[PDB]
Design a protein around this ligand. Structure first.
Ligand SMILES: Cc1cc2cc(C#N)ccc2c(C)c1Nc1ncnc(Nc2ccc(C#N)cc2)n1
Ligand SMILES: [Mg+2]
Lengths: 406, 554
């Protein structure tokens, strides 16, 4: 019934980000939603004295025919104060982790008055024939960094009985998402999840669930080919890949293998491996089987995620903080209605990687997408199904390290 | 007395840390003073302003201007300093509507709302910042001190507050009358509808009646503005629209400014006049920055100007948007990185047209440019019509599939069909994925001295073929490209090539068909003539035979 004082960072005014073009369907959906939200006192009309603005659009969650209002609070979140929980390292060690959407709960807590002006947003009209409908939030808005921090005190006391009753289940909270992990059987797991959402509904669309399996999350080691006959091209690619691996693993040697390439031979000509070469290759395998030396996580640094398009619906990715120091590596080959759409695939990939990163470290990585800025920015909203939005930059120069990760 | 609803005031504040304006009042002639006294007297009668005591420390300069040598003077309050200290507002005037997205109307009536402007009250706690002083005769008495009670003309927040208040007033009327459309511009309200003219007039009278609830009286006469309407450079007709007459001037000599004007008009006219080119005229303005500097027109630009004059020969109109019908956008290649497009619903009836020029870069191909054009048109369409149009592109399906399935980046184009209108976009070469059996293997390399700028470029093969060429005024990268060029020149229709240059490979893997660099262009021309080309990369200085750096170390 009482609000907590919220302010921005010293020397920073509220966000003034432009509203990007919305389609007809999304505009109708947003109008329909914001009408009812206005009726429920969640949002209110504002005048021209509010110059601030935050982009907004609409999506559809995993298998749902009901639109969801999503706000891009990325600029507000980096301008708002740092609201000052040690991340559950056991969350990535559980057998099954269900993601829940507890965003609606935030709408039960009033927002600080003197801060409301900063959550201003605009529903645009087609061709701007009519003035855009401007709103601001009266309660805790979904997607805002302050919402889970403020509601934390409430959420704790809300979940106390369930947590006391089940001391094995690991619960984590990130933005509008609640990650609930356990080692129970999938059926009993679903029963516990349903029990939890019924425990939340009784406490005052939380019916959807998003199940993950951190135990089945496979990692990518560096592998070298095993052939009976090596061509010049094969050996050249091998030496190249090993030379790249030398930046990660110190003891990598290619001298003896390079001795096979001496003399200008044809690329298709088969070269029989000498003993020194085979020994060198063996040692290299043994080195590549070991973990990377001096790899640690720094909570104060940024997570960086790189993605490579491998073709045939396959993508590879790496999450790190320092170059040649991968905290995570992975590979996807998903068929989610994107057989003939690269951008849809890449979007889903970004969402999956981000989800994994949230589970493991507790925050989202900065992406480096193999795509032109315009192309991505034109289409990524049409395939987005997450309540959060990570940061991203664009790489325009084809990385030579593509096939080496495949 | 009929009770009228009070107009809600907008809470206006100054920028944080700033105080109101304190500018001295300029000395005036006795004439101007008398005039201002009379004017401000009647304005005080109307309730626009009010006399204030000596307590108010703020002041804004006021001037008197003789209107075009007439018998009447006019008041001019210089609100610049106050505007510098006035907060920012939500300007809804940003991003004007485009005529191509409008819907045709049988009747469009205009109403004057200039008198409705002064019915908008200024925030009481802000009025003190709008204080101004009329100088007294011979400065022998304390000057007359006024402050505004309504929205001052010239003030920063006046248009935004006016538009917002007016919109808030019109909202229920527009809501309960969905058979009409209302748009506000300056001191004029525009109302359009497809209703029968009687029902329409009825609607207008109902609008006036509704405005009477806030005491807003609009002139009870036929407005002087009837279709067509001149608006933001457009001609708005009931069933069609166009751009205001584009007149290309006749000149024997052109300056920088003249060319800027020309390209301006051409760019503005390119939204309805199809085929308008501007590259040869815009490339003459490369690093000039001298409005009076006369630039000689190249023949390439003269021809372009001629073609533009041929296109702008006779007036061209565009139709309005019909939401019931499908939206189609067709694209054509003009060459030199130029692209043109038309957006229509029914054949030969364009809603609008447009163009796209390639971005600034070192290398590019037609496929990428086509993609970019598609993206631009898509975004523009979502802005204007709120949906994505169906595309007609000069590119084979097979070509596009081959492109996007092999391209290292992720690319996508919405629903589109192929239209056979040359020049068609094509892939000019395609590198192999595996080494070629039987084909000669060219180990290439290039290296240059950084100081003397002396270099060498060349190759060695498995058949024993060799070449080393001396080069002057060159770099390492140039030599590395030159080596590949030599390998392409002296090889058959099928050839393998081994290079250690990450740079060259970085260029060729981007798959350009055109470049700023002549060397790269020559390489491309060599690639097109080949049947099969495999390009392999190896680490340099790693004892890999064939990679004869020793023939370049000299
Ligand atoms: C966005 C807009 C700008 C205007 C600018 C002026 C001016 N000067 C006048 C009226 C204006 C109007 C009604 C507008 N609003 C609007 N909304 C939906 N359809 C249309 N169609 C339309 C069809 C013929 C005509 C004509 N002749 C005008 C608009 N217009
Ligand atoms: Mg070299």
């Amino acid at each position: 019934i009482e609000t907590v004082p919220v302010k921005l960072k010293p020397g920073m005014d509220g966000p003034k980000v432009k509203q990007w073009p919305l389609t007809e369907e999304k505009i109708k959906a947003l109008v329909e939603i914001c009408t009812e939200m206005e009726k429920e006192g969640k949002i209110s009309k504002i005048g021209p004295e509010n110059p601030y603005n935050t982009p907004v659009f609409a999506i559809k969650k995993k298998d749902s025919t009901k639109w969801r209002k999503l706000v891009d609070f990325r600029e507000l979140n980096k301008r708002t104060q740092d609201f000052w929980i040690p991340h559950p390292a056991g969350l990535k060690k559980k057998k099954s982790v269900t993601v829940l959407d507890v965003g609606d709960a935030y709408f039960s807590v009033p927002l600080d008055e003197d801060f409301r002006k900063y959550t201003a947003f605009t529903i645009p009209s087609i061709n701007n024939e009519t003035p855009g409908i401007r709103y601001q939030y009266n309660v805790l808005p979904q997607g805002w960094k302050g919402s889970p921090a403020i509601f934390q005190s409430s959420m704790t006391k809300i979940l106390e009985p369930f947590k006391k009753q089940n001391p094995d289940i690991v619960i984590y909270q990130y933005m509008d998402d609640l990650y609930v992990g356990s080692d129970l059987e999938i059926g009993q797991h679903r029963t516990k999840i349903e029990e939890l959402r019924q425990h939340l509904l009784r406490w005052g669309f939380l019916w959807m669930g998003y199940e993950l399996h951190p135990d089945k999350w496979t990692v990518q080691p560096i592998v070298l080919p095993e052939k009976d006959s090596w061509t010049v091209n094969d050996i050249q690619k091998l030496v190249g890949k090993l030379n790249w691996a030398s930046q990660i693993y110190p003891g990598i040697k290619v001298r003896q293998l390079s001795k096979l390439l001496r003399g200008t031979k044809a690329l298709t000509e088969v070269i029989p491996l000498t003993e020194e070469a085979e020994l060198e290759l063996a040692e290299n395998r043994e080195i590549l089987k070991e973990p990377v030396h001096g790899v640690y996580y720094d909570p104060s640094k940024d997570l960086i995620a790189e993605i490579q398009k491998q073709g045939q619906g396959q993508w590879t990715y790496q999450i790190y903080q320092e170059p040649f120091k991968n905290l995570k590596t992975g590979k996807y080959a998903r068929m989610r209605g994107a057989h003939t759409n690269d951008v849809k695939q890449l979007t889903e990939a970004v969402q999956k990687i981000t989800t994994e990163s949230i589970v493991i470290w507790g925050k989202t990585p900065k992406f480096k997408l193999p795509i032109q800025k315009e192309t991505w920015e034109t289409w990524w909203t049409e395939y987005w199904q997450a309540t959060w939005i990570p940061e991203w930059e664009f790489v325009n120069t084809p990385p030579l390290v593509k096939l080496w990760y495949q | 007395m009929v009770p009228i609803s009070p107009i809600e005031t907008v809470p206006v504040k100054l920028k944080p840390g700033m105080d109101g304006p304190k500018v001295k009042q300029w000395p005036l002639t006795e004439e101007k003073i008398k005039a201002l006294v009379e004017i401000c007297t009647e304005m005080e009668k109307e309730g626009k302003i009010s006399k204030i005591g000596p307590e108010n420390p703020y002041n804004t300069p006021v001037f008197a201007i003789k209107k075009k040598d007439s018998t009447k003077w006019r008041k001019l309050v210089d609100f610049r300093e106050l505007n510098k200290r006035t907060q920012d507002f939500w300007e809804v005037q940003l991003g004007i509507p485009h005529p191509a997205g409008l819907k045709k109307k049988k009747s469009v009536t205009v109403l004057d709302v200039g008198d409705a402007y002064f019915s908008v009250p200024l925030d009481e706690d802000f009025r003190k910042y709008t204080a101004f002083t009329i100088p007294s005769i011979n400065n022998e008495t304390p000057g007359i001190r006024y402050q505004y009670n309504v929205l001052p003309q010239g003030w920063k927040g006046s248009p935004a507050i006016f538009q917002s208040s007016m919109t808030k007033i019109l909202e229920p009327f527009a809501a309960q009358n969905p058979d009409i459309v209302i748009y506000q511009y300056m001191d004029d309200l525009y109302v359009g509808s497809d209703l029968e003219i009687g029902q329409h007039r009825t609607k207008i009278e109902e609008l006036r009646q509704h405005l009477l609830r806030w005491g807003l009286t609009t002139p009870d006469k036929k407005h002087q503005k009837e279709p067509p309407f001149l608006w933001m450079g457009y001609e708005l007709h009931p069933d069609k629209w166009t751009v205001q007459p584009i007149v290309l001037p006749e000149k024997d000599s052109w300056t920088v400014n003249d060319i800027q004007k020309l390209v301006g008009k051409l760019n503005w006219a390119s939204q309805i006049y199809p085929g308008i080119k501007v590259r040869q005229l815009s490339k003459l303005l490369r690093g000039t920055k001298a409005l009076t500097e006369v630039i000689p027109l190249t023949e390439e630009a003269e021809l372009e100007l001629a073609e533009n004059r041929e296109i702008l020969k006779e007036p061209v109109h565009g139709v309005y948007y019909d939401p019931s019908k499908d939206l189609i956008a067709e694209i054509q290649k003009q060459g030199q990185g130029q692209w043109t497009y038309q957006i229509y619903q029914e054949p030969f009836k364009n809603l609008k047209t447009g163009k796209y020029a390639r971005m600034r870069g070192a290398h590019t191909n037609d496929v990428k440019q086509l993609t970019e054009a598609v993206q631009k048109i898509t975004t523009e369409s979502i802005v204007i019509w709120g949906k994505t149009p169906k595309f007609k592109l000069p590119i084979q399906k097979e070509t596009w599939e081959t492109w996007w399935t092999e391209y290292w980046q992720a690319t996508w184009i919405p629903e589109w069909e192929f239209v056979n209108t040359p020049p068609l976009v094509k892939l000019w070469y395609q590198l192999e994925k595996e080494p070629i059996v039987g084909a000669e293997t060219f180990y290439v390399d290039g290296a240059a001295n950084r100081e003397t700028k002396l270099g060498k470029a060349g190759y060695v093969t498995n058949k024993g073929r060799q070449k080393v060429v001396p080069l002057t005024n060159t770099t390492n990268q140039k030599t590395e490209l030159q080596a590949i060029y030599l390998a392409l020149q002296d090889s058959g229709l099928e050839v393998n090539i081994v290079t250690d240059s990450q740079y060259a490979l970085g260029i060729i893997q981007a798959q350009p068909d055109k470049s700023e660099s002549e060397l790269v262009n020559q390489i491309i021309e060599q690639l097109i003539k080949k049947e099969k080309v495999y390009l392999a990369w190896v680490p340099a200085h790693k004892g890999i035979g064939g990679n004869e750096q020793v023939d370049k170390l000299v």
